[PDB]
């Protein structure tokens, strides 16, 4: 493995559901690289299904210097329409920060994200009453739990 993520930092937290995501990502690079890093952020619409994923935005990063570098990755918010149910935005949901090299995913950082609505006490509700909540999306705020990343790694052939 040539590139390794050292730290990611959520610049705007908490944020409105509709605010764009701002991440300061810092990473190490052991030998220099011919191609760009391809970054991507994905909003997980559904726990059971991958087909409600929303690739929020992508970012090419390059050229890659050896050492320790950093950039800001700004990503569009999720689109409420592509959700199975409106109340899904509420509670804990997931985002996947991912980086690929030459169309091959090498790292995937998952985050859990708390979502709360103004005036709504979710904690004392059961799932079935949450479904009844008339969500006003401009009143929903997220907090990414940026201190508990769930990293997955993948082996790839880098410049060989």
């Amino acid at each position: 493995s040539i590139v390794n993520i050292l730290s990611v930092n959520v610049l705007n937290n908490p944020a409105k559901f509709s605010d764009p995501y701002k991440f300061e990502i810092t990473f190490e690079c052991l030998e220099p690289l011919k191609s760009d890093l391809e970054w991507k952020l994905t909003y997980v619409g559904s726990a059971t299904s991958q087909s409600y994923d929303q690739i929020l935005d992508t970012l090419l990063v390059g050229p890659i210097p050896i050492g320790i570098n950093k950039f800001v990755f700004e990503a569009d918010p999720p689109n409420i329409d592509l959700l199975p149910q409106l109340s899904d935005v509420l509670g804990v949901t997931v985002i996947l920060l991912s980086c690929a090299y030459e169309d091959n995913e090498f790292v995937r950082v998952g985050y859990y994200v708390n979502n709360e609505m103004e005036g709504l006490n979710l904690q004392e509700m059961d799932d079935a009453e949450i479904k009844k909540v008339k969500v006003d999306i401009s009143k929903v705020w997220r907090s990414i739990l940026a201190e508990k990343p769930r990293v997955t790694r993948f082996n790839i052939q880098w410049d060989n």
């Binding site: 810092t26 760009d36 992508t58 970012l59 090419l60 990063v61 390059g62 050229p63 890659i64 210097p65 050492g67 320790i68 570098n69 950093k70 950039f71």
Partner: peptide, 10 residues
């Protein structure tokens, strides 16, 4: 879309 990263020392 594409950008270059700012290096970080030491």
């Amino acid at each position: 879309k594409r950008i270059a990263p700012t290096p970080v020392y030491p």
